[PDB]
Design a binder for this molecule. Structure first.
Ligand SMILES: [Zn+2]
Length: 159
């Protein structure tokens, strides 16, 4: 068995960026009524916490009935700023409601427990307390969390 003792300072990432952004402020990629963003990625891939906080929701797909469930696996957590972030269309959860979380921590596994077409990732970010009084529905751009994310082939601006 292999065992690690020392950790890295910067951190590695062999996974590529499925998107560049996601905003339902103008018009979504054919997904109407969407309050988040979706990234086509095969089911069973470990989902890590994009930022430390607290689990406000943990919809475990391991024992979830279809009595009160239809979307499948979901995870709502309060980020480091107090904002909210959901993780939907997963196949499993490693967390639990009211439990504390940490960035990069495996909070679940990707899935397709919603509609049967293809597995993906749903990332919805909202304020600490939204103003659902029309305007944004509290849902905004994940670009703030994707800027500190890995590199897809290498996107240069000029130089
Ligand atoms: Zn979605």
């Amino acid at each position: 068995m292999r065992g690690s003792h020392h950790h890295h300072h910067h951190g590695s990432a062999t996974y590529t960026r499925p998107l560049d952004t996601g905003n339902i402020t103008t018009g979504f990629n054919g997904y109407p009524g969407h309050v988040g963003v979706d990234y086509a990625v095969p089911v069973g891939t470990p989902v890590r916490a994009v930022a430390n906080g607290t689990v406000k929701f943990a919809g475990n797909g391991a024992n979830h009935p279809w009595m009160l469930w239809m979307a499948g696996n979901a995870v709502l957590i309060q980020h480091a700023d107090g904002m909210h972030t959901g993780y939907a269309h997963l196949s499993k959860i490693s967390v639990s409601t009211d439990s504390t979380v940490k960035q990069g921590q495996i909070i679940g596994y990707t899935g397709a427990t919603g509609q049967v077409t293809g597995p993906h990732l749903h990332f919805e970010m909202l304020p600490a307390n939204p103003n659902w009084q029309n305007g944004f529905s509290g849902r905004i751009d994940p670009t703030g969390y994707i800027a500190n994310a890995p590199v897809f082939n290498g996107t240069t601006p000029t130089e």
